[PDB]
Coordinates of all heavy atoms in Angstrom, one line a residue:
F278 N 92.9 85.7 108.7 CA 91.6 85.8 109.2 C 90.7 85.9 107.9 O 91.1 86.5 106.9 CB 91.3 87.1 110.0 CG 92.1 87.2 111.2 CD1 93.5 87.6 111.2 CD2 91.7 86.8 112.5 CE1 94.3 87.7 112.4 CE2 92.4 86.9 113.7 CZ 93.8 87.3 113.5
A279 N 89.5 85.4 107.9 CA 88.5 85.5 106.8 C 87.6 86.7 107.1 O 87.1 86.8 108.1 CB 87.8 84.1 106.6
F280 N 87.4 87.4 105.9 CA 86.2 88.5 106.0 C 84.9 87.7 105.9 O 84.8 86.7 105.1 CB 86.4 89.5 104.8 CG 87.6 90.4 104.9 CD1 88.7 90.2 103.9 CD2 87.7 91.5 105.7 CE1 89.7 91.0 103.9 CE2 88.7 92.2 105.8 CZ 89.8 92.1 104.8
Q281 N 83.9 88.3 106.6 CA 82.5 87.8 106.4 C 82.1 88.1 104.9 O 82.8 88.9 104.2 CB 81.6 88.4 107.4 CG 81.7 88.0 108.8 CD 80.6 88.4 109.6 OE1 79.5 88.5 109.2 NE2 80.9 88.7 111.0
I284 N 81.4 91.8 103.4 CA 82.6 92.7 103.3 C 83.5 92.2 102.2 O 83.9 93.1 101.4 CB 83.3 92.6 104.7 CG1 82.5 93.3 105.8 CG2 84.7 93.3 104.5 CD1 82.9 92.9 107.3
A285 N 83.6 91.0 102.1 CA 84.4 90.4 100.9 C 83.7 90.9 99.6 O 84.4 91.1 98.7 CB 84.4 89.0 101.0
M288 N 84.6 94.5 99.1 CA 86.0 94.8 98.7 C 86.2 94.3 97.2 O 86.9 95.0 96.5 CB 86.9 94.0 99.7 CG 86.9 94.5 101.1 SD 87.9 93.6 102.2 CE 89.5 94.3 101.9
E305 N 89.5 109.9 101.6 CA 89.0 109.1 102.5 C 90.0 108.7 103.6 O 89.7 108.6 104.8 CB 88.4 107.9 101.9 CG 87.1 108.1 100.9 CD 86.0 108.9 101.6 OE1 85.7 108.7 102.8 OE2 85.4 109.7 100.8
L306 N 91.1 108.4 103.1 CA 92.2 108.0 104.0 C 92.6 109.2 104.9 O 92.9 109.1 106.0 CB 93.5 107.5 103.3 CG 93.1 106.1 102.5 CD1 94.2 105.8 101.7 CD2 92.5 105.1 103.4
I307 N 92.8 110.4 104.3 CA 93.1 111.6 105.1 C 92.0 111.9 106.1 O 92.3 112.3 107.3 CB 93.4 112.8 104.1 CG1 94.7 112.7 103.4 CG2 93.3 114.1 104.9 CD1 94.9 113.6 102.2
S308 N 90.8 111.8 105.8 CA 89.7 111.9 106.7 C 89.8 110.9 107.9 O 89.6 111.3 109.0 CB 88.3 111.8 106.1 OG 88.1 112.8 105.3
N309 N 90.1 109.7 107.6 CA 90.5 108.7 108.7 C 91.6 109.1 109.5 O 91.5 109.0 110.8 CB 90.7 107.3 108.0 CG 89.5 106.6 107.5 OD1 88.4 107.1 107.6 ND2 89.7 105.4 106.9
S310 N 92.6 109.6 109.0 CA 93.8 110.2 109.8 C 93.3 111.3 110.7 O 93.7 111.4 111.9 CB 94.9 110.6 108.7 OG 95.5 109.5 108.1
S311 N 92.5 112.2 110.1 CA 92.0 113.4 110.8 C 91.1 113.0 112.0 O 91.3 113.5 113.0 CB 91.2 114.3 109.8 OG 90.7 115.4 110.6
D312 N 90.3 112.0 111.8 CA 89.4 111.4 112.8 C 90.2 110.8 114.0 O 89.9 111.0 115.1 CB 88.4 110.3 112.3 CG 87.3 110.9 111.4 OD1 87.3 112.1 111.3 OD2 86.6 110.2 110.8
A313 N 91.3 110.0 113.6 CA 92.2 109.5 114.5 C 93.1 110.5 115.4 O 93.3 110.4 116.6 CB 93.2 108.7 113.8
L314 N 93.4 111.5 114.8 CA 94.0 112.7 115.4 C 93.0 113.4 116.3 O 93.5 113.8 117.4 CB 94.6 113.7 114.2 CG 95.9 113.2 113.5 CD1 96.1 113.8 112.1 CD2 97.2 113.4 114.5
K316 N 90.7 112.1 117.9 CA 90.5 111.2 119.0 C 91.6 111.3 120.1 O 91.3 111.4 121.2 CB 90.2 109.8 118.6 CG 89.6 108.8 119.7 CD 89.1 107.6 119.1 CE 88.4 106.8 120.2 NZ 87.7 105.5 119.8
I349 N 100.2 107.0 103.7 CA 99.5 108.1 104.3 C 99.9 107.8 105.8 O 99.5 106.8 106.4 CB 98.0 108.0 104.2 CG1 97.6 108.3 102.8 CG2 97.3 109.0 105.1 CD1 97.8 107.0 101.8
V350 N 100.6 108.7 106.4 CA 101.1 108.6 107.8 C 100.4 109.6 108.7 O 100.3 110.8 108.3 CB 102.7 108.8 107.8 CG1 103.2 108.5 109.3 CG2 103.4 107.9 107.0
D351 N 100.1 109.2 109.9 CA 99.4 110.0 110.8 C 100.0 109.8 112.2 O 100.5 108.7 112.5 CB 98.0 110.3 110.8 CG 97.3 109.0 111.3 OD1 97.3 108.7 112.5 OD2 96.7 108.3 110.4
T352 N 99.9 110.8 113.1 CA 100.2 110.5 114.5 C 99.0 110.5 115.3 O 99.0 111.0 116.5 CB 101.3 111.6 115.0 OG1 100.8 112.9 114.7 CG2 102.6 111.3 114.4
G353 N 97.9 110.0 114.8 CA 96.7 109.8 115.6 C 96.7 108.8 116.7 O 97.8 108.3 117.1
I354 N 95.5 108.4 117.1 CA 95.4 107.5 118.2 C 95.9 106.0 117.9 O 96.3 105.3 118.9 CB 93.8 107.4 118.6 CG1 93.8 106.6 120.0 CG2 92.9 106.8 117.5 CD1 92.5 106.9 120.7
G355 N 96.0 105.7 116.6 CA 96.4 104.4 116.3 C 95.4 103.3 116.6 O 94.3 103.6 117.1
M356 N 95.7 102.0 116.4 CA 94.8 100.9 116.5 C 95.4 99.8 117.3 O 96.5 99.4 117.1 CB 94.3 100.4 115.2 CG 93.3 101.3 114.5 SD 93.2 101.1 112.7 CE 94.7 101.9 112.1
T357 N 94.7 99.2 118.3 CA 95.1 98.0 119.0 C 94.8 96.7 118.1 O 94.2 96.8 117.0 CB 94.3 97.9 120.3 OG1 92.9 97.6 120.0 CG2 94.3 99.2 121.1
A359 N 92.9 94.4 119.1 CA 91.5 94.2 119.2 C 90.6 95.1 118.1 O 89.7 94.7 117.6 CB 91.0 94.4 120.5
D360 N 91.2 96.3 117.9 CA 90.7 97.1 116.8 C 90.8 96.5 115.4 O 89.9 96.4 114.7 CB 91.3 98.6 116.8 CG 91.0 99.4 117.9 OD1 89.9 99.2 118.5 OD2 91.9 100.2 118.3
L361 N 92.0 96.1 115.2 CA 92.3 95.5 113.8 C 91.6 94.3 113.5 O 91.2 94.1 112.3 CB 93.8 95.3 113.7 CG 94.7 96.5 113.6 CD1 96.2 96.2 113.9 CD2 94.6 97.4 112.4
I362 N 91.3 93.4 114.5 CA 90.7 92.1 114.3 C 89.2 92.1 114.5 O 88.4 91.7 113.7 CB 91.3 91.0 115.1 CG1 92.8 90.8 114.8 CG2 90.6 89.6 115.0 CD1 93.5 89.9 115.7
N363 N 88.8 92.7 115.5 CA 87.4 92.7 116.2 C 86.6 94.0 116.0 O 85.5 93.9 115.3 CB 87.4 92.2 117.5 CG 88.0 90.8 117.8 OD1 89.0 90.7 118.5 ND2 87.5 89.9 117.2
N364 N 87.0 95.0 116.6 CA 86.2 96.2 116.7 C 86.0 96.9 115.3 O 84.8 97.2 115.0 CB 86.8 97.3 117.6 CG 87.2 96.7 119.1 OD1 88.1 97.2 119.6 ND2 86.4 95.7 119.5
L365 N 87.0 97.0 114.5 CA 86.8 97.6 113.1 C 86.0 96.7 112.2 O 85.3 97.1 111.4 CB 88.1 98.0 112.5 CG 88.7 99.3 113.1 CD1 90.3 99.3 112.8 CD2 88.0 100.6 112.9
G366 N 86.1 95.4 112.5 CA 85.2 94.4 111.8 C 83.8 94.5 112.1 O 82.9 94.5 111.1
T367 N 83.5 94.9 113.3 CA 82.0 95.2 113.7 C 81.6 96.5 113.0 O 80.4 96.4 112.4 CB 81.9 95.4 115.3 OG1 82.5 94.2 115.9 CG2 80.4 95.5 115.6
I368 N 82.3 97.4 113.0 CA 82.0 98.8 112.3 C 81.8 98.4 110.7 O 80.8 98.9 110.1 CB 83.0 99.9 112.5 CG1 83.2 100.1 114.1 CG2 82.6 101.2 111.9 CD1 81.9 100.6 114.7
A369 N 82.8 97.8 110.2 CA 82.9 97.4 108.9 C 81.5 96.7 108.4 O 81.1 96.9 107.3 CB 84.1 96.6 108.4
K370 N 81.2 95.7 109.2 CA 80.0 94.8 108.9 C 78.7 95.7 108.5 O 78.1 95.5 107.5 CB 79.8 93.8 109.9 CG 78.7 92.7 109.5 CD 78.5 91.5 110.5 CE 77.2 90.8 110.0 NZ 77.3 89.3 110.6
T373 N 79.2 98.3 105.6 CA 79.1 97.6 104.3 C 77.7 97.4 104.0 O 77.3 97.5 102.8 CB 80.0 96.3 104.5 OG1 81.4 96.6 104.5 CG2 79.8 95.3 103.1
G393 N 81.2 104.8 106.8 CA 82.2 104.5 107.7 C 83.3 103.4 107.2 O 84.0 102.9 108.0
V394 N 83.2 103.1 105.9 CA 84.0 102.1 105.4 C 84.9 102.8 104.2 O 85.3 102.0 103.2 CB 83.2 100.9 104.8 CG1 82.7 100.1 106.0 CG2 82.0 101.3 103.8
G395 N 85.2 104.1 104.3 CA 86.0 104.8 103.4 C 87.4 104.2 103.2 O 87.9 104.4 102.2
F396 N 87.9 103.6 104.3 CA 89.2 102.7 104.2 C 89.2 101.8 102.9 O 90.3 101.8 102.3 CB 89.3 101.9 105.4 CG 90.5 101.0 105.4 CD1 91.8 101.5 105.4 CD2 90.4 99.6 105.4 CE1 92.9 100.6 105.4 CE2 91.4 98.7 105.4 CZ 92.7 99.3 105.4
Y397 N 88.1 101.2 102.5 CA 88.1 100.3 101.4 C 88.2 100.9 100.0 O 88.6 100.2 99.1 CB 86.8 99.4 101.3 CG 86.6 98.5 102.6 CD1 85.3 98.1 103.0 CD2 87.7 97.9 103.3 CE1 85.1 97.3 104.1 CE2 87.5 97.0 104.4 CZ 86.2 96.7 104.8 OH 85.9 95.9 105.8
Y400 N 91.3 100.5 97.7 CA 91.4 99.3 96.7 C 90.9 99.7 95.3 O 91.2 99.0 94.3 CB 90.7 98.1 97.1 CG 91.3 97.3 98.3 CD1 90.8 97.6 99.5 CD2 92.4 96.6 98.1 CE1 91.5 97.0 100.8 CE2 93.1 96.0 99.2 CZ 92.6 96.2 100.5 OH 93.3 95.7 101.6
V406 N 96.9 96.6 100.6 CA 97.1 97.7 101.6 C 97.8 97.1 102.7 O 97.3 96.1 103.4 CB 95.7 98.2 101.9 CG1 95.8 99.3 102.9 CG2 95.0 98.9 100.6
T407 N 98.7 97.7 103.3 CA 99.4 97.4 104.5 C 99.2 98.5 105.6 O 99.5 99.7 105.3 CB 100.9 97.2 104.3 OG1 101.1 96.1 103.3 CG2 101.5 96.6 105.7
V408 N 98.7 98.1 106.7 CA 98.5 99.1 107.8 C 99.4 98.8 109.0 O 99.3 97.8 109.6 CB 97.1 99.2 108.3 CG1 96.8 100.1 109.3 CG2 96.1 99.3 107.0
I409 N 100.3 99.7 109.2 CA 101.2 99.6 110.4 C 100.7 100.6 111.4 O 100.5 101.8 111.1 CB 102.7 100.0 110.1 CG1 103.2 99.2 108.8 CG2 103.6 99.7 111.3 CD1 103.1 97.8 108.8
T410 N 100.4 100.2 112.6 CA 99.8 101.0 113.7 C 100.4 100.8 115.0 O 100.6 99.6 115.4 CB 98.3 100.9 113.4 OG1 97.6 102.0 114.2 CG2 97.8 99.5 113.9
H412 N 99.0 101.9 118.9 CA 98.1 102.5 120.0 C 98.8 102.6 121.3 O 99.6 101.7 121.7 CB 96.8 101.7 120.0 CG 95.8 102.4 120.9 ND1 94.6 102.9 120.4 CD2 95.7 102.3 122.1 CE1 93.9 103.3 121.5 NE2 94.5 103.0 122.6
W420 N 98.6 95.1 109.8 CA 97.4 94.5 109.2 C 97.6 94.6 107.7 O 98.1 95.6 107.2 CB 96.2 95.2 109.6 CG 94.9 94.8 109.0 CD1 93.9 94.2 109.7 CD2 94.3 95.1 107.8 NE1 92.8 93.9 108.8 CE2 93.0 94.6 107.7 CE3 94.7 95.7 106.6 CZ2 92.1 94.6 106.5 CZ3 93.9 95.8 105.5 CH2 92.7 95.2 105.4
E421 N 97.2 93.5 107.0 CA 97.5 93.5 105.5 C 96.4 92.7 104.8 O 95.9 91.6 105.3 CB 98.9 92.9 105.3 CG 99.3 93.0 103.8 CD 100.7 92.6 103.6 OE1 101.0 91.4 103.6 OE2 101.6 93.5 103.4
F428 N 92.6 88.7 105.5 CA 93.6 89.6 105.9 C 94.6 88.8 107.0 O 94.2 87.9 107.5 CB 93.0 90.9 106.5 CG 92.2 90.6 107.8 CD1 92.8 90.9 109.0 CD2 90.7 90.4 107.7 CE1 92.1 90.7 110.2 CE2 90.0 90.2 108.9 CZ 90.7 90.4 110.1
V430 N 97.3 89.7 110.3 CA 97.8 90.6 111.5 C 99.0 89.9 112.1 O 99.0 88.8 112.3 CB 96.6 90.9 112.5 CG1 97.3 91.6 113.6 CG2 95.5 91.5 111.9
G441 N 100.4 106.0 116.3 CA 99.8 106.5 115.0 C 99.7 105.4 114.0 O 99.7 104.2 114.4
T442 N 99.5 105.8 112.8 CA 99.2 104.7 111.7 C 99.9 105.2 110.4 O 99.9 106.5 110.0 CB 97.6 104.7 111.5 OG1 97.0 104.3 112.8 CG2 97.2 103.7 110.5
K443 N 100.4 104.1 109.7 CA 100.7 104.2 108.4 C 99.9 103.4 107.4 O 99.7 102.1 107.8 CB 102.3 103.8 108.1 CG 103.3 104.5 108.9 CD 104.8 104.0 108.5 CE 105.7 104.7 109.1 NZ 107.1 104.1 108.7
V444 N 99.1 103.9 106.5 CA 98.5 103.2 105.5 C 99.4 103.2 104.2 O 99.5 104.2 103.5 CB 97.1 103.7 105.2 CG1 96.4 102.9 104.1 CG2 96.2 103.8 106.4
Ligands
72K705 C1 87.8 99.5 108.9 C2 89.2 99.9 109.0 N1 89.4 101.3 109.0 N2 90.8 101.2 109.1 C3 91.4 102.6 109.5 C4 92.6 103.0 108.8 C5 93.3 104.0 109.2 C6 92.9 104.8 110.4 C7 93.7 105.8 110.9 N3 94.4 106.6 109.9 O1 93.9 106.0 112.1 C8 91.8 104.3 111.1 N4 91.5 105.0 112.3 C9 90.2 104.8 113.0 C10 90.5 103.6 114.1 C11 89.3 103.4 115.0 C12 89.1 104.6 115.9 O2 87.9 104.5 116.7 C13 88.8 105.8 114.9 C14 90.0 106.0 113.9 C15 91.0 103.2 110.7 C16 91.3 100.1 109.1 C17 92.7 99.8 109.2 C18 93.0 98.5 109.2 C19 92.0 97.5 109.2 C20 90.7 97.9 109.0 C21 89.6 96.8 108.9 C22 88.8 96.8 107.8 N5 87.9 95.8 107.7 C23 87.9 94.8 108.5 C24 86.9 93.8 108.4 C25 86.8 92.7 109.3 C26 87.6 92.5 110.4 C27 88.6 93.6 110.5 C28 88.7 94.7 109.6 C29 89.6 95.7 109.8 C30 90.4 99.1 109.0

Side-chain angles (χ1 to χ4, degrees):
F278 304 80
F280 293 111
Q281 287 188 39
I284 291 160
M288 291 177 87
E305 300 304 325
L306 299 177
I307 289 167
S308 287
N309 285 355
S310 288
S311 178
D312 288 356
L314 287 155
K316 194 169 185 174
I349 298 74
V350 183
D351 68 69
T352 50
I354 193 159
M356 288 161 282
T357 67
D360 288 331
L361 291 170
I362 299 169
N363 304 117
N364 309 152
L365 294 161
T367 306
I368 306 297
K370 189 177 165 155
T373 292
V394 291
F396 175 66
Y397 296 148
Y400 293 98
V406 177
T407 308
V408 181
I409 313 303
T410 192
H412 180 109
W420 179 104
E421 188 174 75
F428 68 91
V430 176
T442 304
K443 299 183 179 184
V444 180

